[PDB]
Amino acid sequence: SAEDKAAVERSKMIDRNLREDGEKAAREVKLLLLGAGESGKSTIVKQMKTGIVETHFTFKDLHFKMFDVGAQRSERKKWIHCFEGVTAIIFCVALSDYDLVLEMNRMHESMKLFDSICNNKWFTDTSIILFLNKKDLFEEKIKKSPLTICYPEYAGSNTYEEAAAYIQCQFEDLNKRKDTKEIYTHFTCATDTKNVQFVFDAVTDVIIKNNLKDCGLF
Amino acid sequence: SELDQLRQEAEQLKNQIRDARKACADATLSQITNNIDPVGRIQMRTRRTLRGHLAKIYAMHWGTDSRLLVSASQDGKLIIWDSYTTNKVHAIPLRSSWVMTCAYAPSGNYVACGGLDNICSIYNLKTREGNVRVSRELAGHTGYLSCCRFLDDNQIVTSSGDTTCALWDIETGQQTTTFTGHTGDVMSLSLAPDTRLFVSGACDASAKLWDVREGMCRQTFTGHESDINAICFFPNGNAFATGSDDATCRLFDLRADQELMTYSHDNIICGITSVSFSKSGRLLLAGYDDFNCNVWDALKADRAGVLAGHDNRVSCLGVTDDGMAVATGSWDSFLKIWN
Amino acid sequence: QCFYNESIAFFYNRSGKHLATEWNTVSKLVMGLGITVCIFIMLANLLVMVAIYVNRRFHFPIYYLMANLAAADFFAGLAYFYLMFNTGPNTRRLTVSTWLLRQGLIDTSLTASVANLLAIAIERHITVFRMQLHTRMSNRRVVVVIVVIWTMAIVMGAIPSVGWNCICDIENCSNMAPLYSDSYLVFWAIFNLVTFVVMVVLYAHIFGYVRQRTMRMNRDTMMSLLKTVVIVLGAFIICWTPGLVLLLLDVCCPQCDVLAYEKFFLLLAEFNSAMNPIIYSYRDKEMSATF
Amino acid sequence: SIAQARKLVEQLKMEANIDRIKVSKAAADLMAYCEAHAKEDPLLTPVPASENPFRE
Ligand SMILES: CCCCCCCC/C=C/CCCCCCCC(=O)OC[C@@H](O)COP(=O)(O)O
After folding, report:
1. Residue B333's closest CA among B56, B91, B14?
2. Does the CB of A196 have a partner CB in chain C at under 8 Å?
């Protein structure tokens, strides 16, 4: 009974440290980085700052963690449920692949992956930040190759703005929970370096809306 | 030409194996066990509850002493508890918050864990300083580590989603042996009492019995209609049980090379995450995604109780070597001891 | 010194009020309207409470504060119902103790209602200005504010009976509450006004913060939030302004016609209690459906 | 995929050659080992609280 009490103090200290760590980690935004192969996700990671990679950074007194699982190459259906509760899902897609083929168009594969992730039973209330990279290449390629290669239903002049807006709508139309979740789109810009600002603003809006939802101010 | 004749030979040999399994099947388990009397309802109440985890619990394991246990949570914590006094003995912070398995060495000196990091982290508890330290970090797998069990104090068997398993020597750090043959992500494994053989289950709806020394596969067992999430070994060492996502458990035999009993119910459609046997092998405790665990009579396939004390998916289930308790851990961040 | 031996007739004659021992049309009219409002308040708040109880989704601090507000409104309705069947002619038979108790019940009930409104505003301001997701529950704070609310209400209700009354200083009595003093009226009015301005400030800060940090990015949340805020504030204003004005006139202006519109103003202040639940439980679709 | 088929066949050959005993004997041995350890299973036969460390 003499030494049996020190275990109680050890347990109390362990619980205090656990509570402190939980309070420290609860105020850290969590982002899941996804995207089909041969995308601009590496560029995003570089702009921010062998199975899974973690990138921690800070912006305007707000800490963010980004988890990349590109080196898994396994059945996603088994481990996708591990990222439940993350603050957002950053989905990267390159437009330049609208005509490239890996057979099949990589754009259709990216759209299938987006439909599988967004409409997943685990991610029913998480927000998605869509990064349509390779804006310059897609703007300079449409001048010769039309968008009809992938989207034959498209009808419009071969211009950057029209085709980009059409692709944005096509990617946003795959969402089914139009009211539970919202999708934030941003065409990546390298010169301005505002991607982190966009992510910060999106996360802030998400948090504010959740708070309003929680205190009866729907 | 070669591919066609090889395919035909494989098909004919599989048919021959089927005919052999059929010929050796003269009766069924239930028919021989109809004379024995049931054991009745098994009522087990929560005797202790463990709190402290701030996120989902993904795995646990009991020690040889049947008193200390371990549990990993997505919060980046691996907690070692004392079941008797529900006192948090150890709390190790992981460099990666993605962990999906735990292992307590039989000697109790080392512990292991792994997950999406694809590394098996061996921690030495009995260090001179008194503060746990990462003893080793086994790498080489090309997928997530699903299960790991300490075969000894220096060797360890691990399974990954790369469709292979690996026996490692902790000291050297290199794969002592590699086991291939599976066509899907291996999700669970179980060691035999003698440690000379071990069975592994994958998402290909098939299990395989591998030998350690020779490094070859002895037998392959089928029958499931979906992935295999858990698997346990019978104490006698001559049979095992497998749990899948199709809401069904199945008992396979080694010598007979055929299934014996199927534990399933029409009212259950949820998946299975963990299964365990009693010290006598009469009972079979299986955790489901219906927020509860079910106790089946191995020799009769009749439910003998229901453990309903969790508000979320039951992720892990374990039984001690003594057989005087059962531990259950769920995504609700709570562990519960029964009887 | 203190005139505890005299009857209620002396107190009512010292002022300009009239006993009216005989029944009258206005008395029956106000009694009917009051009992109607009381049954409405009680039914609505009991429905809110049972809905929060049966449904387990509403097990958060905000819903606990809403349930406490509903209970306070139910208590106010019960106190107003007890005030009926005891006013006008029956007032001629009540003694000092019964009179003080009757007034203190209404006082404590309405103070509890106002304090619950203020606490709801504070909790909303807190929950809006956090920067975390999946925050853990903390019932200690809501329990603490609830007990503080009820203690302050009971204190404001018991104070007038214990020592603070016009029994020992008759020269300065109220014209509507002959036994109560005017200092208590001023204190109550100041408390109400500070609570109201605090609520307004908090909600305005909330609106500004939300607008600023969501302008950079189907239905616009700005319009809905503005509507909710303006409604919450306007109900309070239209339901508690004339009563405060009447108390202020009673304490400040002699020879003012104050004894006329007191009962209507009290009825309006009570109808505030019926408006509160429908105001704080109509946006929530799940709450409405639970009914 | 000649090497893969070769390895698969060479592996299944070892599975084809097994000294399998009748399933009746398997069930008999299972029931025997299950009945010979009945007194040793606490859960199957609840032990008095005096011997349960999880009670007192
Ligand atoms: C005048 C109404 C103001 C609005 C309601 C808020 C009152 C909150 C309480 C504040 C403490 C001081 C209140 C003094 C005025 C209360 C007058 C009153 O509520 O009496 C009830 C009256 O009918 C019946 O009078 P009798 O027929 O003589 O019994």
Report:
1. B56
2. no
